C-alpha cells in the first residue's frame, strides 16, 4: 500500500482537501466478559513481627481495601449501552455460575447468555488460586512464616495489576477509556482479536494497528459477587474496510487584500475526515473521532453525521445547487496557517508579516494579503506572525487548483451575517433579508 496522497488546494474557498486515504469505519461493538477470580480472605490471626510477614500483611490489607473499593463502586450513549446491558444480564442469578462452570478448566470459552447473546470470556488474572495456595497455607495458624522473598515480590507484582485496575476505575467512576494496558495486555488483546467473528481482512487490519483499537475501545464494570470480578471490554469491529476517505482542511479567507478598518470573512464549517459508507458519504465533525495512522485513517460512527453522496460537490463548486454547503461568516481578521498533509495554507492578513522559511536557504518566499498555499517541496518551516509552524515533510502529488476568491461576489455596501454557523443556502437567505432591510429603509426614506 504505497502512500499516494494527493492534496488539491483550492483558491475558491481556500480549503485544501487531501485524498488517497483508505479509511475503516466502525459500526458496532463486540462486548466480551473478562473475569478476575478474587478471593474473600478473612483477617488473618497472625502476630509475627518479622519484616517479610509485616510486608505481606500490608499487601493483603491493600488487596482487601481494593476489593472493598470495588464493591463500593458496584454499590451504585451507545458508548456504554451494550456493556451496561451485558452487566445487567450478568446480574441475573445463575449467569455467574455458568461463566465459572465454563471457565472451570479453560482460560477461554464461549458462553451463551439467558437472553441469547453469546460472549467470549477470559481469565486474565488468578488471584484466588495464588492466594489460597501460597499465602493462606503458611500464614494460617498463630505461627507466621514466610521464608521466600521471591514469594512476596511475586505477590506484589501480581497484585499490582489489580491495584492499577482499581485505581483507574475509581478515578474514572466505573467506566474507563482508552483501554489501558493494565486492563488488557497486548498479547491477550491480540488473542481476542484472533477469535473475533469477522473475515480475515478486518482481522488483519485490526491486527496491524493495535494502538488504534486501544484508543477506540472501552471498558466497563459489571459485578463483584461469588468471588468473581467481571469487567466487560467493548472492542470494536469495522464493517466497512478500505473505503475512500479524504480530509477537508479549511482556512479563513478574508476580504480582497485588507480593507482598512473592518470587513467580512468565510471559513468552512465542516472539517475533519470524510468517508464513503454504502453509497452515502459519512461525515465526522469532531477531531477526536477519527485517528490517522500511516496512509489509512480509522474512524468511529458513534456520532458521525451521515450525509448524501453529493458532498463532493461542495469542494469543486461551492455554489452548486445539487448539494447544500455551509460557511461560518465572521468579521475577525486573524492571520492563521492551517497546516495540511502536503502543504500549508497561510491567510496573511493586515499588519502582520508572514514569510516562508528554509533552514539552509533562509527566507525564500514572502506572502501577501490572501490565503496563499505553500507546497512541502523546497519549504520546511513557515513563519507567520510571531510563531513558526513546521511544514510536513511528506511527499505527494500536490495540485494547486487555483481560481478566484468567493468574496468578490458579495455586496460591498454591507457585509451582513456576523457570527453565523449555518448552511450556505441559509446565508443566501440572510444576505437576501439584510438587503431587504436596506431596500425597505431606502424606499421608506424616499416615500418620506
Amino acid at each position, epitope marked *: 500500500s504505497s502512500q499516494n496522497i494527493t492534496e488539491e488546494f483550492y483558491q475558491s474557498t481556500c480549503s485544501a482537501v487531501s485524498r488517497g486515504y483508505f479509511g475503516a469505519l466502525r459500526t458496532g461493538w463486540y462486548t466480551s466478559v473478562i473475569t478476575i477470580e478474587l478471593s474473600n480472605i478473612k483477617e488473618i490471626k497472625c502476630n509475627g513481627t518479622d519484616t517479610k510477614v509485616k510486608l505481606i500483611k500490608q499487601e493483603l490489607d491493600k488487596y482487601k481495601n481494593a476489593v472493598t473499593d470495588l464493591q463500593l463502586l458496584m454499590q451504585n450513549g451507545s458508548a456504554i449501552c451494550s456493556g451496561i446491558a451485558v452487566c445487567k444480564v450478568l446480574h441475573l*442469578e445463575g449467569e455467574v*455460575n455458568k461463566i465459572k462452570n*465454563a471457565l472451570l478448566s479453560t482460560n477461554k470459552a464461549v458462553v451463551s447468555l439467558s437472553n441469547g447473546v453469546s460472549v467470549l470470556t477470559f481469565k486474565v488474572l488468578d488471584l484466588k488460586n495464588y492466594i489460597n495456595n501460597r499465602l493462606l497455607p503458611i500464614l494460617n495458624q498463630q505461627s507466621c512464616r514466610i521464608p521466600n522473598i521471591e514469594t512476596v515480590i511475586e505477590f506484589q507484582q501480581m497484585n499490582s495489576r489489580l491495584l492499577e485496575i482499581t485505581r483507574e476505575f475509581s478515578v474514572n467512576a466505573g467506566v474507563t477509556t482508552p483501554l489501558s494496558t493494565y486492563m488488557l495486555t497486548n498479547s491477550e488483546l491480540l488473542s481476542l482479536i484472533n477469535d473475533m467473528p469477522i473475515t480475515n481482512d478486518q482481522k488483519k487490519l485490526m491486527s496491524s494497528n493495535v494502538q488504534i483499537v486501544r484508543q477506540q475501545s472501552y471498558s466497563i464494570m459489571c459485578i463483584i459477587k461469588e468471588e468473581v470480578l467481571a469487567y466487560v471490554v467493548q472492542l470494536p469491529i469495522y464493517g466497512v474496510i478500505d473505503t475512500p476517505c479524504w480530509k477537508l482542511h479549511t482556512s479563513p479567507l478574508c476580504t480582497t487584500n485588507i480593507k482598512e478598518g473592518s470587513n467580512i470573512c468565510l471559513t468552512r464549517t465542516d472539517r475533519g475526515w470524510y468517508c464513503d459508507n454504502a453509497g452515502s458519504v459519512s461525515f465526522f465533525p469532531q477531531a477526536d473521532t477519527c485517528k490517522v495512522q500511516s496512509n489509512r485513517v480509522f474512524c468511529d460512527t458513534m456520532n458521525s453525521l451521515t450525509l448524501p453522496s453529493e458532498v463532493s460537490l461542495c469542494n469543486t463548486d461551492i455554489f452548486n445547487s445539487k448539494y447544500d454547503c455551509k460557511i461560518m461568516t465572521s468579521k475577525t481578521d486573524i492571520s492563521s496557517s492551517v497546516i495540511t498533509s502536503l502543504g500549508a495554507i497561510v491567510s496573511c492578513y493586515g499588519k502582520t508579516k508572514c514569510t516562508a522559511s528554509n533552514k539552509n536557504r533562509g527566507i525564500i518566499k514572502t506572502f501577501s494579503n490572501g490565503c496563499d498555499y505553500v507546497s512541502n517541496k523546497g519549504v520546511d518551516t513557515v513563519s507567520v506572525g510571531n510563531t513558526l509552524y513546521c511544514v510536513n515533510k511528506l511527499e505527494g502529488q500536490n495540485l494547486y487548483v487555483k481560481g478566484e476568491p468567493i468574496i468578490n461576489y458579495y455586496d460591498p455596501l454591507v457585509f451582513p451575517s456576523d457570527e453565523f454557523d449555518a448552511s450556505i443556502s441559509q446565508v443566501n437567505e440572510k444576505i437576501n433579508q439584510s438587503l431587504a432591510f436596506i431596500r425597505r429603509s431606502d424606499e421608506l426614506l424616499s416615500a418620506i
Partner: antibody, heavy 116, light 107 residues
C-alpha cells in the same frame, strides 16, 4: 471444606408453622445466595426458588407461592424458612443449597412429618 | 420451562456391566447439565460439573458426553460401593427442573 448445617426434624400438626434453618460456614455469607429445594416422598426433587443473602429479596416458583417464605439473618450467618398454613402435602425433606462451580451443593436433609 | 426426563427409570445391572443413562430436554441447552447420586436416607452430591467434566473425588469410571438436547453418561465399570438413585438437572435458567430418578439396582 465448605459445610452447610440445617436444623433438626419435626413432627407436628396441620395449620401451624414450621421453622427450618440452614447455617452456612466456610465462606463470607454476603455474596453466595441461598437456594431451597423440595423432595416429595418417593417422587423427584422440586425447586422452591432463591433468597439473596446480600439484600433479602426472594423470588418464588409459581408452584410454591402463597404459603412459603424464607428470611435470613446475615449477622448470624443463618437463613431460615417459615412454613405457615401447613398442608398434608408438606411431608418430605428440605434442602439448602448454593452454586458451587456449576451444579448445586446441598447439605444434609431434614425430614418433616405431618401427623393428625 | 424446560422439562427433563430419563429413559431408564428402573435399572438393574451386574457387577461388571457398562450402564448408560440418557436425559432429554424440551428445549435446547448448551451443555449446562449435571447428575446427582442420591444415597438412601442421605444427601446427594454432584459428580459431573458439566456435560463432559467429571467432578473432583469421583472415580474415573464416571464420565459424560453430549450437547444440545441429548445428554448421556458413561460408566466404565459398576462397583458395588456405587448404588442409589440418579437424577439429572439443568441450570440454563430459572425455574430448575429435575428428572424422574434413575433407580439403579444390582442384578
Amino acid at each position: 471444606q465448605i459445610q452447610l448445617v440445617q436444623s433438626g426434624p419435626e413432627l407436628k400438626k396441620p395449620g401451624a408453622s414450621v421453622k427450618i434453618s440452614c447455617k452456612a460456614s466456610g465462606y463470607t455469607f454476603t455474596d453466595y445466595s441461598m437456594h431451597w429445594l423440595k423432595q416429595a416422598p418417593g417422587k423427584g426433587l422440586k425447586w422452591m426458588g432463591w433468597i439473596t443473602t446480600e439484600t433479602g429479596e426472594p423470588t418464588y416458583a409459581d408452584d410454591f407461592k402463597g404459603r412459603f417464605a424464607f428470611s435470613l439473618d446475615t449477622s448470624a450467618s443463618t437463613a431460615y424458612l417459615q412454613i405457615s398454613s401447613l398442608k398434608a402435602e408438606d411431608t418430605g425433606v428440605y434442602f439448602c443449597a448454593r452454586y458451587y462451580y456449576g451444579p448445586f451443593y446441598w447439605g444434609q436433609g431434614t425430614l418433616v412429618t405431618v401427623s393428625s | 420451562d424446560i422439562q427433563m426426563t430419563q429413559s431408564p427409570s428402573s435399572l438393574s445391572a451386574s457387577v461388571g456391566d457398562r450402564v448408560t443413562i440418557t436425559c432429554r430436554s424440551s428445549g435446547n441447552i448448551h451443555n449446562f447439565l449435571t447428575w446427582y447420586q442420591q444415597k438412601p436416607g442421605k444427601s446427594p452430591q454432584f459428580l459431573v460439573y458439566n456435560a463432559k467434566t467429571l467432578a473432583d473425588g469421583v472415580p474415573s469410571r464416571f464420565s459424560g458426553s453430549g450437547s444440545g438436547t441429548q445428554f448421556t453418561l458413561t460408566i466404565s465399570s459398576l462397583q458395588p460401593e456405587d448404588f442409589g438413585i440418579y437424577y439429572c438437572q439443568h441450570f440454563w435458567t430459572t425455574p430448575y427442573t429435575f428428572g424422574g430418578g434413575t433407580k439403579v439396582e444390582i442384578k
